[PDB]
Amino acid sequence: ALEEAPWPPPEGAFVGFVLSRKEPMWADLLALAAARGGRVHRAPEPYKALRDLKEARGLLAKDLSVLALREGLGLPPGDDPMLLAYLLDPSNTTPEGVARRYGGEWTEEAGERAALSERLFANLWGRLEGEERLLWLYREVERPLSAVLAHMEATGVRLDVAYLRALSLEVAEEIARLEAEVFRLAGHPFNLNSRDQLERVLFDELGLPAIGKTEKTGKRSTSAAVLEALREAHPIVEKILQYRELTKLKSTYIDPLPDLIHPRTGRLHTRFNQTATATGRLSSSDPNLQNIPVRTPLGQRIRRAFIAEEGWLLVALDYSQIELRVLAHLSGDENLIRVFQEGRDIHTETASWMFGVPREAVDPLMRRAAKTINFGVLYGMSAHRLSQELAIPYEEAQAFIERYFQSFPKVRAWIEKTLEEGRRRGYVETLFGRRRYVPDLEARVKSVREAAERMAFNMPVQGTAADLMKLAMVKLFPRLEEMGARMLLQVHDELVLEAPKERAEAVARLAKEVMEGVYPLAVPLEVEVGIGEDWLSAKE
């Protein structure tokens, strides 16, 4: 179809490329092509050809940019049809689907990918015309953010490998102690990793009371919540919970991470997926660095393995109570606004009630426990679940939920208004106009409809917080480059940077200010910042 023309392509051409594997830091670049003006140009040798491009423009542009950075080439990502489609409808998350939906087919040939990028860009650009607010998000947030993400991905983070290896050996011995006790208590060995085998042991052999059922298959659940309720019924329960905690951490973090160090950089490299969530948040994968443990003693030990380069420090910055502040702005609730104008902390207040201690006596881990409670209740947690999680009577859980919303009267009104508009329009939106379609708001099945409602009224809050963080990253990145500091990770409302020791204090101050001032709301945004040699010490 397209006239095949000699490499290289003219400037502004759209690229297509094929990787040996999905991870750009680990992939071999198998093929590269570009398309423009009814022509397709195929590179005879992809790696060398990379040097001819001045911009990665096309589907998955960021990925190619990350591969280019890895090879020491400064090839920034530009237009990407994925970002246009994702803004039109965040269910647009794969090139396979976007292609089918907007005008072609995602194949495994670079030339075809190049032509496809060009055609999809034309069509999607046409769909965005008139959508002033989505276009603003594209130009002011998503497009420039992809460049920032590319640098983050290519930079990676330093990990204390020997430390994790040593930790693995210690945790293995403790796991053996736990499994042996579980087998002694069961009266026989079995695969303790199999929730099917454990189910039979707990509920059929030991005759414990089943408490809950699983979603898809209706099996008797062995979840931590069920085990928690059974803690008193049998000694084997506590041992299983401890085994579960250790094996989770070992199988997910301690063992896999050390093996993922890149041979060229000597660092660990995640992917920051820009078109992966329904709300506008980023996700992180291969490996996921947005869920590194932090709650338990062993989890904290693991977080300590994330460290600064010699002569550098980590700077960790985290928005205070962020979705509550966002909620205050979206809902306009006078009481909630006043909470933040007065410098109050709702997590600490709930924690002090939960644990029956003065606010001054609330420690960091008590405060963290209050977050599930505060956001749980806000986004529709049942009194039954609440009562179970707090080990208080059903009636007390009910009253806590009532006082919560009674304290902030306009919140319920905002929720109702949000749902009404979502029903009529078919979508809900963030402060900046990012959309999520929620068709099930009119489902005739109550459980399905109500589930859709909770998704719907949560999206403007979580999504607005996401837009704010993305905007802050776009503003902050060029200031960091100027100071010779690096942006390493984003964890939803937190950034982790790496700075030369002599500039770390200046970097911390500047980053705090950029993040707090990103987009003034009806309440102040506050950012907590710490500096340290490891990720744990840097969050104070």
Added chain:
DNA sequence: GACCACGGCGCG
């Protein structure tokens, strides 16, 4: 060796 669905669980 691969894929999936599921339950389960780590973080935000």
Added chain:
DNA sequence: AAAGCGCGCCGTGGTC
């Protein structure tokens, strides 16, 4: 498990 929401990865079980 339960009327929190958003993710990605683990091992098991079942295929292919």
